[PDB]
């Protein structure tokens, strides 16, 4: 989930 | 050049992130007139004899892109990780927020405070033994607050500033 959407977080990518 | 502390408030939907911030900034409990969008706020306060400026990001809209959130998660100096004492699922999410902060700060050493909000409610489902054991495993303070009555609110933010002061 992230949990937050952060553009440079590899898990979000 | 007054010291500035950059703080970020994170946690599951509905735990009281905005309520905690709005009590400190505006001296009232959140109502239908307060905005619901993610934003940052500034407040001059005196903490342990030091007059300082707090710059606080109140996170919201967690699944959507936010240029502000991208900037402020990297520059944030301390994080309030909030759960609600009547919602076990929000407490179970804490470790995910903490792991994300460490991943984006690229560090194992990030100032943080664990906050159990809604302590005015009788329907406690998260025992303080479980929350204190989690905070102790991370080496961080644990505080219980009620944004509704304002109990512990100022102390939660002052405790986080005290943790940031130990980073340097
Ligand atoms: N009983 C009680 N209710 C609270 C407390 N703090 C917040 N609430 C209630 O919880 C709900 C969410 O509060 P809010 O401050 O908007 O939470 P939030 O985490 O910013 C919500 P979002 O993630 O969508 O931005 C509201 O109905 C509010 O009245 C508290 O300390 N006690
Ligand atoms: Mg909010």
Author numbering:
A (entry chain E): 1 to 13
B (entry chain A): 0 to 167
Please give sentences taken from the publication describing this entry:
After exploring different strategies, we successfully replaced the disulfide bond with a thioacetal crosslink involving a d-Cys residue at position 5. Accordingly, we solved the co-crystal structure of KRAS loaded with a non-hydrolysable GTP analog (GMPPCP) bound to MP-9903, a peptide containing MP-6483's same macrocyclic sequence but with only one arginine at the N- and C-termini. Despite GMPPCP loading of KRAS in the MP-9903 co-crystal structure, the protein adopts the off-state (GDP-loaded) conformation, and the peptide binding pockets can easily be superimposed. Interestingly, the MP-9903 peptide bond connecting d-Cys5 and Pro6 adopts a cis conformation allowing the cyclic part of the peptide to occupy the same binding site. Due to the opposite chirality at residue 5, the N-terminus has a more solvent exposed trajectory. Consequently, the hydrogen bond between the backbone carbonyl oxygen (O) of Arg4 and side chain nitrogen of KRAS/Arg102Nη is disrupted and Arg102 hydrogen bonds to the backbone carbonyl oxygen (O) of d-Cys5 due to the amide bond flip. All the other interactions observed between KRAS and KRpep-2d were also observed in the crystal structure of the KRAS – MP-9903 complex (except the interactions that involve the terminal arginine). The extension of the linker between d/l-Cys5 and Cys15 by a methylene (thioacetal) group increases the Cα–Cα distance by 0.65 Å and remains solvent exposed. Specifically, RBD binds at the PPI interface between the switch I and switch II regions, whereas MP-9903 binds at the allosteric pocket between Switch II/helix H2 and helix H3. Upon binding of RBD, H2 moves towards H3, however binding of MP-9903 moves the switch II and helix H2 towards the PPI interface.
